[PDB]
Amino acid sequence: AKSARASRIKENHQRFKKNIAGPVEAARLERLSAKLMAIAQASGVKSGKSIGRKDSSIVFPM
Amino acid sequence: MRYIHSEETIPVPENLKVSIKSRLVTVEGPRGKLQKDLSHIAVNFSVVKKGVIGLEIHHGSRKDVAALRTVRTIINNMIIGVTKGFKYKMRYVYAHFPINVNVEKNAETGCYEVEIRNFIGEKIVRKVVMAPGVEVEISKAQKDELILSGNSLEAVSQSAADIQQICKVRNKDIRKFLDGIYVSEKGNIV
Amino acid sequence: MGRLQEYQVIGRHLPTEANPNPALYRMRIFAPNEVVAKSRFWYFLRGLKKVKKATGEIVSVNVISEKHPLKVKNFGIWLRYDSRSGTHNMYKEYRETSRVAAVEAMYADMAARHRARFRSIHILKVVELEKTEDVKRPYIKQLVAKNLSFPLPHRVPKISTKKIFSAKRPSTFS
Amino acid sequence: MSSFESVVVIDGKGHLLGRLASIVAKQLLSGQKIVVVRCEALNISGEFFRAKLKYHAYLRKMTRYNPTRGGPFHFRAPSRIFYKAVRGMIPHKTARGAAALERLKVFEGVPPPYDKKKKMVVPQALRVLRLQPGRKYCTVGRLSHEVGWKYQDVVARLEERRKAKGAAYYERKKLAARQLSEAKKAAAAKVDPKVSEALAAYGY
Amino acid sequence: AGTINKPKKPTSKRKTTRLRAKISKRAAEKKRKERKLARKNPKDPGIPNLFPYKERLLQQREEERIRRKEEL
Amino acid sequence: AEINVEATSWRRVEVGRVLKLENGSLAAIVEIIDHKRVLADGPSSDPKLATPRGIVPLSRALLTPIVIPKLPRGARTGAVKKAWEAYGVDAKWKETNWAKKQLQQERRQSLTDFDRFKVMRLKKQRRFEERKALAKI
Amino acid sequence: GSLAFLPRKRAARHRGRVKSFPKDDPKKPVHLTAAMGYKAGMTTIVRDLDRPGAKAHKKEVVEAVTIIDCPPMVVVGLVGYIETPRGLRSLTTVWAEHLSDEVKRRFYKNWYKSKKKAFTKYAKKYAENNGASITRELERIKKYCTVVRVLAHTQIRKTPLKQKKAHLMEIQINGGSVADKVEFGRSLFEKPVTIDTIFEKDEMIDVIAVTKGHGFVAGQMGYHHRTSVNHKIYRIGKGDDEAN
Amino acid sequence: PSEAGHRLYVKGRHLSYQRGRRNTHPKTSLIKIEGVDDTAAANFYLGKRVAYVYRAQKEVRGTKIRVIWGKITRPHGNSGVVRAKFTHPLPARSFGASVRIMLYPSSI
RNA sequence: AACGCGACGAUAACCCGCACGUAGACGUAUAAGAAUAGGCUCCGGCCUCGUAUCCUAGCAGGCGAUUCCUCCGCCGGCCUCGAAGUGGCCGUCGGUAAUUCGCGUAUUGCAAAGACACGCGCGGGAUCAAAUCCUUUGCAGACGACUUAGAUGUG
């Protein structure tokens, strides 16, 4: 019997992944993301748009 | 013996554009552009006359002059590809199960895909991805024959070998089972 | 074998009442110094004929300076080295300005390519090629070829071994 | 030439593993602080199959009992490979060797604190200056990737971003050179010919 | 072969002193045996052809022979 | 039929090429011995640039751009001196960029302590002129 | 036994670590990757088999099926990870105001004797127009981060257990650009997420738990962290339907 | 403000003692002086005064600085390394330590 | 990793007492990348050479001018930096030989214990915020260990 890691079995599994389970999982995740979105919608420094500082074993002590 | 100097010459036709910046030989012709990096060998390029490129080695060995000869040949093949281009007439034979071949332009990646069916009756469909830059057509002049046309000799030959290798018989007497897809003609477009 | 010198050594058998006035034999020896030259001379005489050191005397030792040290020229050397199998003859060509330099390059090439030692190499003859076209060896005839002009690609520049750290990356175009 | 520095940064691209590591070890014993970058860009002579064969033999070397104490830990990071070389050349079991190892730091890629710093090279270890043109060579990063190193792509994108920022820095350096040279000429237009001739005579 | 991926047992180049001593003794025995066989018991190559002045050397040899005949 | 080749244009060693030794003198090549050693001589009247006729190693030799046009092979000291004076090798060496660097290095080495202090002051002044100019620009 | 699962170690954490998430590509639409529940028990179902080529095709098949009680989970945080030559690392996390009593019990160990002070200054920072700092953290996540996870907690106060401490876990957001997924999480803050939202009907998943410790009759036998792969959700029930 | 240096010495590194392969002699030390790499430079630096400065974690004369004095005597090898003799041998953990070579006595 | 790392939450600040102030700094200044049978560029030209550049004067570096608007430094604003996180610009203020002076330096002899302030510390006192012990739980248990729940409550 061919091993579970055989090249032929891997190629057939990849073909199955790209041709059969692909669209099914795509539509599944599409409706899932749709329901996710349904539930979800259901001065620079002074405003915080500019990223600033909050609040060393890489460099030798100086 | 450490030969002091050796040179070879490559003539170029009147209708090409050859450029070597560091070692990237880029040749421009009517059909397109072919670029190959030759950074793995030590050669000195020059233009020794109006239309002949001189490739030289100084203080090199016999292996180095052999490299000069082979790189000369590769450059000449690039010139031939950009002037005339290469054609491979491929033939397929069957005994009782007719082989079906379909070539399609996969638009994404812009590449040909060749699918082979009913090869000795196996339900598997052998799909081979095609080399970039070379074109495949189903010949109408002869039957059970394909044409592989391209600019790059290396690409077209590797693709033809890939087809002739994917269509290979397993665990059967080769003396009796003669099915397969085989190289028939190798030439220039012109 | 070192900075060699060419010595003309003349020796003779000791005089005897029965046989006075011997024939006064002569040789040319490439040796680092006069003592080695005399040792080589007596070795060759005892190897060839019966005359030995105890029964002979060296009447002359002289240096043979190269006639034109400032001229590059071609040498052909006929040699007979002894290997594991036996004595083998060779003729090798060299390009130098002096006979001693030719012999030194000869010894270096012999040691490098055939593992032949000083005790195993016998210098049978060395000759200056008077006229061109007497060159038979490609590795000299290529230098003898007319209008020789070549570059020197991939020159590693001399950076002092004591300058460990370099700020700029060397270039090899000089 | 025989210069003493606070710390020496060595760009590891194009350097022979053994020669560079030996020089670094000698510098550590001399007391000079050394840091090495682009350990993935380090180079090893010979052929890549020879390199894979020897390091796979190293992997084959294991202790019999649980590989947790006293067992050879096979570090697949290129920086740790350089560290293993330097450690083999360092008297690592002594206090002096421990001090040298603490003085040494090795990294993969170039973090910002050293990308905003100058990188030195060692001529005695450069692949270009040392190996014959016809000889083959291999990459420590490629060896590490094919033996098990997991972050070749990470350092790839980080290095590319560093390349973009360095290109921008060079463009601003070009502009600075423009202004500097133009200032040289404009000031030299009225630079007190006496003092200018004084500088010329003294050689500056 | 898959030696590249799975190396085998290494062959140690660290010679042992016992092996070195045995080799030394046996080689000495070999030298003595060669000497014993030799005591038991039971062509010049010439001037090379490629020499540029071999003809001149031959003429000198013939002339030297003529002078030897004249002397004797 | 257009060819665009950008390769490295090395300097060729030939009879007439003048090389700079490690001792700072110049010598024209008279004839090439091997691929690593040559015969060279500099009959320069200047004592600093003078070089005796002899064997020069190409490893210790550095190729200068100056070349003697039609120096015959085997030209002896008189002919080489004639070619040197006729072609003006000394003047072209003085014009060469390498000689400028050599003079600058020798002169920096010959600077004394008080000369160094004057260099300090005078560089400070010259710097003052530029510093302002750079703001202006 | 198998060498991949020895020596027999106790599970360091009673919850169970996810370790590996599915690989991310930007092309898919946004979605969470994980959810949590509580193993209630198992029942028996009979099914009209729809497996072509099977002996029992189109026949009654009796199977045993696990029930996992899955109350809605509450989003209370976002985290931004950065990719480094030393792996992924937590760059910065943002919390939500009005954190639940039960997630606070998770933050505490002795809740009965401790005055409830956790995250009080953080809520104050939200309240006192440090939205500058808030947007700063969110912009940092959008600009520097490549992987974002939503902190979500499951609610014992709805589960029928004597427990009262909630359950927290990080859940990766895949299928989109970093800015898109950060905006999605920001919308997600303070909203329950259902299992109808996270997972869906008749689908194959992976389940992580800690297998039981067989104690009191060479060492630890039981209580092992196990992620069993390839288990098929057949049904999702609603609670409120009463026709579940 | 001067904004300049006060250094009147040449930097060096105490590296090791005069040693064979398995036998060391602490009475004499090896010093690598900065900038010198030849026997001529070592000859220039011959006969010189040398100071090793270290901290003490206790004040004796109002300072924790202690100085061990010595002299560069004759060169070592060909790399410009020089040999030095002190009143007291340098500790041992000063292998690789900074040392000051003075400019006196001067022959200029 | 029980002596590898990160993000986050929540803390320990006061009163009295008393105890001390470098595995190697001395200008510890200098970021393109990339190739080395090519590269750089100002597009003129340039490349063996870091043998370079920057900086470099004043009581261990004073006072006052002369005179300069050149650099340096501190804080704010604007943005910027995430691989083990920072720099630029602008603005304020302080200092500032580029030029040129007059004042003081000594006898430390020809080289080799005062006050104040700032911190790290301990001995007690009370202050938070917690952890552990205790009880309970039993998805756990050779014993440790682990999941919970005990201060108003869906306890």
PDB file of C-alpha atoms (C1' of nucleotides) in Angstrom, chain B residues 22-23 43 57-58, chain I residues 35-39:
ATOM      1  CA  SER B  22      27.298  42.941 -16.058  1.00  0.00           C
ATOM      2  CA  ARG B  23      26.748  39.420 -17.344  1.00  0.00           C
ATOM      3  CA  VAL B  43      34.547  35.648 -19.391  1.00  0.00           C
ATOM      4  CA  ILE B  57      39.653  34.311 -21.221  1.00  0.00           C
ATOM      5  CA  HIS B  58      43.006  35.528 -19.897  1.00  0.00           C
TER       6      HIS B  58
ATOM      7  C1'   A I  35      29.576  43.630  -8.100  1.00  0.00           C
ATOM      8  C1'   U I  36      34.654  42.034  -7.782  1.00  0.00           C
ATOM      9  C1'   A I  37      35.907  39.194 -15.991  1.00  0.00           C
ATOM     10  C1'   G I  38      33.389  45.751 -12.393  1.00  0.00           C
ATOM     11  C1'   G I  39      31.630  49.855  -9.902  1.00  0.00           C
TER      12        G I  39
END
